[PDB]
């Protein structure tokens, strides 16, 4: 192919918007024409009036942490058996991170939705619902951390 | 890359000054006094083409009246006559007949007072 018309197709539009002229965006620069449009304005998102935000609403979302910090406890990642539907043989955590799901987010909890499938599934937890559906052939390798 | 002014400014400037030849004093020298002058000159022209169409309306009518008043009647009357007489013609422009071939103007006046008396 030639060097003419590698031309970026259809929409590149590098045309930024310059306001120095008598056509388009004049004197004032396409916006402005007053005062406090001049080097800064207070926010908004959160600010202003000088009034009372809407920091008038309270934090009943209480229980918010004391000095030495958060507590390190075990955390559980879910995965609907509908997703297990693909791959076959024996499913084990870590074999799940080596794939779209789980990754390091620690203890596996299989649960939930979609038709089950006949195979052994190693986990730390299942929901009520999920464990039953695995009755039509399957596994309860559970507990672990041992 | 810097992109200094370069040649550009001069060229927008004398584009205009050519447009300004022969206005009085600083209005053909200064590349901004000239601009201000040219603005009004523009508007003046637009307004005045409009006006031309009117300035000759007056002329044609002023001398038709002179001419047909020379046969007895007046302009008001003469035009009404032609209207009824069915001659969608004259076209005030083309009543220069009053000056060239008054023989034939005379004829038209008869037709006119025909429908009028």
């Amino acid at each position: 192919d030639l060097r003419p018309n590698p031309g970026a197709n259809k929409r590149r539009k590098r045309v930024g918007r310059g306001p120095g002229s008598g056509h388009g965006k004049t004197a004032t620069r396409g916006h402005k024409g007053q005062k406090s449009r001049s080097g800064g304005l207070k926010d908004p998102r959160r600010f202003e009036g000088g009034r009372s935000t809407t920091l008038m609403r309270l934090p009943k979302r209480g229980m918010q942490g004391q000095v030495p910090g958060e507590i390190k406890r075990p955390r559980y990642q879910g995965v609907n058996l509908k997703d297990l539907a693909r791959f076959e043989g024996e499913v084990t955590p870590e074999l799940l991170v080596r794939a779209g799901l789980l990754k390091k987010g620690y203890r596996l909890k299989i649960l939930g939705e979609g038709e089950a499938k006949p195979l052994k599934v190693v986990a730390h937890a299942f929901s009520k619902s999920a464990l039953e559906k695995l009755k039509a052939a399957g596994g309860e390798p559970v507990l672990l951390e041992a | 890359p810097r992109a200094k002014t370069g040649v550009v400014r001069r060229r927008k400037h004398k584009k205009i000054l050519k447009l300004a030849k022969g206005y009085w004093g600083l209005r053909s020298k200064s590349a901004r006094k000239a601009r201000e002058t040219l603005f009004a000159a523009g508007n003046y022209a637009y307004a005045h083409r409009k006006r031309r169409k009117r300035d000759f309306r007056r002329l044609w009518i002023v001398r038709i009246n002179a001419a047909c008043r020379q046969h007895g009647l007046n302009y008001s009357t003469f035009i009404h006559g032609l209207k009824k007489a069915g001659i969608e013609v004259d076209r005030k422009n083309l009543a220069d007949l009053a000056v060239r071939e008054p023989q034939v103007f005379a004829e038209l006046v008869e037709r006119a007072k025909a429908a009028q008396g």
Binding site: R45, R46, T54, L55, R57, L58, P59, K60, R61, Q64 | -
Partner: protein, 63 residues
Amino acid sequence: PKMKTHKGAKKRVKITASGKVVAMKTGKRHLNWQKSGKEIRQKGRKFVLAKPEAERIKLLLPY
């Protein structure tokens, strides 16, 4: 460079799956003395409109 989350919003308003902004009805931390059981009973959470688009913008990174 790089935004900081508005700690006093995080501390008081959770944000839903749809993107709505949800918090606790104002007006009951010493109002009481005698108001209807109806009044103080009626404190679960709620929507806010237009003004949550602002709230949200401040919980940038965490979502």
